[PDB]
Design a protein around this ligand. Structure first.
Ligand code: HEM
Ligand SMILES: CC(C)c1ccc(C(=O)O)cc1
Ligand SMILES: [Cl-]
Length: 393
């Protein structure tokens, strides 16, 4: 009753161009079986949203990668928030929601905005840049480690470690096994930086440790939550900002609209998150048989959610393949949905908003003037290199 497909969503051909295969996945039915990896797949908005919003049945505590923690050893101790179910999830979630809350945003906004304005001014001084290395990477590297209160030495481990983490959500293909078998120095750095004495007061990390006396988390849990922020807080925004620049380069009319009204910057970033979905896919594991779109899924089965496909599903979105910075984007699943919905989403939106605002106010044109090169990751979508020429306003 469930169609079986041989599409490999973790192959280089898929990463190079996933949209045709994503349509095939959506149009085959509400639930498919992926013979390549023996998992169920859901690619339509309705089913992705339903799965995300039933975390008891489609749980996270058995891993959100292909591996089932009840069958295999986790490559690292499980995340206490990403890879936990309620009620164990609830208190760490509350701590991270309070660390990365509105008030903390007000405390970091001026530095983030100044850094974004300064970056755009510098890049306009460069004229010809790599929008990845020189912008999408450089800006978050210039503000997020400070906001975490990391020392200067070793911050070079953050992006490699993140790539590993996201590769490790994939199947045991070359990307995953490559990341995990040689990984140890990055793990050593991250774990060391998670300890209270190495995290400067006033930063996100030290605030996590500071919540360890409120009764929400214990001292032994705080390092692992800092590890969550060091895993998730940099690379996702790098590919999101890269996505937004790529969209504005490919849709010059939308750049002109954004320049004319820079207050669209936040929505312009949000629509980029919808349009490219930096985080493409995540798994759940069924804790019971669950009829989903008329299809039966067994106990203990992995279910692959195609977030990007849900964000391009024509059943839900008008002109899904257009980048529209005045689109009503609310309801997209690029940040997830439900109890695990991105707890860092305000940081991501702040970085994206202030950077797109800086471009809107300072840049007249973004023209691609070189080969665009894609970065391959089992979970992340984004570019390796995006050479552009920036014309000043
Ligand atoms: C463009 C930027 C970002 C994107 C697209 C993104 C995407 C996502 C998605 C799809 C989820 C849901 C995972 C799931 O349901 O299993 C998630 C959760 C999470 N994100 Fe982000 N994220 C971004 C930025 C950030 C930042 C900047 C931080 C921290 C500083 C962060 C930290 C987290 C954490 C800790 C979770 C787990 C929350 C939970 O399990 O309750 N993310 N993110
Ligand atoms: C959703 C993604 C950005 C993410 C990755 C790792 C963790 C963690 O280590 O807790 C959380 C979220
Ligand atoms: Cl680790």
């Amino acid at each position: 009753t469930i169609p079986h497909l041989a599409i490999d969503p973790f192959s280089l051909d898929f990463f190079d161009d996933p949209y045709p295969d994503q349509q095939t996945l959506r149009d085959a039915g509400p639930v498919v079986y992926l013979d390549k990896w023996n998992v169920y797949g859901v690619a339509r908005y309705a089913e992705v949203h339903a799965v995300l919003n039933d975390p008891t049945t489609f749980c996270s505590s058995r891993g959100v990668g292909l591996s089932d923690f009840k069958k295999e050893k986790p490559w690292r101790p499980p995340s206490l928030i990403l890879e936990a179910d309620p009620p164990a999830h609830t208190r760490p979630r509350a701590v991270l929601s309070k660390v990365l809350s509105p008030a903390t945003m007000k405390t970091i906004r001026d530095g983030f905005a100044a850094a974004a304005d300064a970056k755009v001014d510098e890049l306009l001084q460069r004229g010809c840049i790599d929008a990845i290395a020189d912008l999408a990477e450089a800006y978050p590297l210039s503000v997020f480690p400070d906001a975490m209160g990391l020392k200067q030495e070793g911050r070079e481990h953050l992006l490699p470690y993140a790539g590993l983490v996201f590769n490790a959500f994939g199947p045991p293909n070359e990307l995953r096994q490559t990341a995990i078998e040689r990984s140890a120095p990055h793990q050593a750095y991250v774990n060391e930086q998670c300890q209270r004495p190495n995290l400067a007061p006033g930063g996100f990390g030290a605030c996590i440790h500071a919540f360890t006396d409120t009764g929400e988390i214990t001292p032994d849990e705080a390092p692992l939550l800092v590890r969550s922020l060091l895993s998730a807080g940099l690379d996702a925004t790098v590919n999101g900002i890269g996505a937004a620049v790529y969209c504005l380069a490919r849709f010059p009319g939308e750049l002109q609209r954004l320049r004319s009204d820079p207050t669209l910057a936040r929505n312009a970033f949000e629509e980029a998150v919808r349009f490219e979905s930096p985080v493409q896919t995540f798994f759940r594991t069924t804790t019971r048989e669950v009829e989903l779109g008329g299809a039966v899924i067994g106990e203990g089965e992995k279910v692959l959610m195609f977030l990007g496909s849900a964000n391009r599903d024509p059943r839900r979105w008008s002109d899904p393949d257009l980048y529209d910075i005045t689109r009503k984007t609310s309801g997209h699943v690029g940040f997830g949905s439900g109890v695990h919905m991105c707890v860092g989403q305000l940081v991501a939106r702040l970085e994206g908003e202030v950077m797109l605002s800086a471009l809107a106010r300072k840049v007249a044109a973004i023209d691609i003037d070189g080969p665009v090169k894609r970065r391959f990751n089992n979970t992340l979508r984004g570019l390796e290199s995006l050479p552009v020429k920036l014309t000043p306003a």
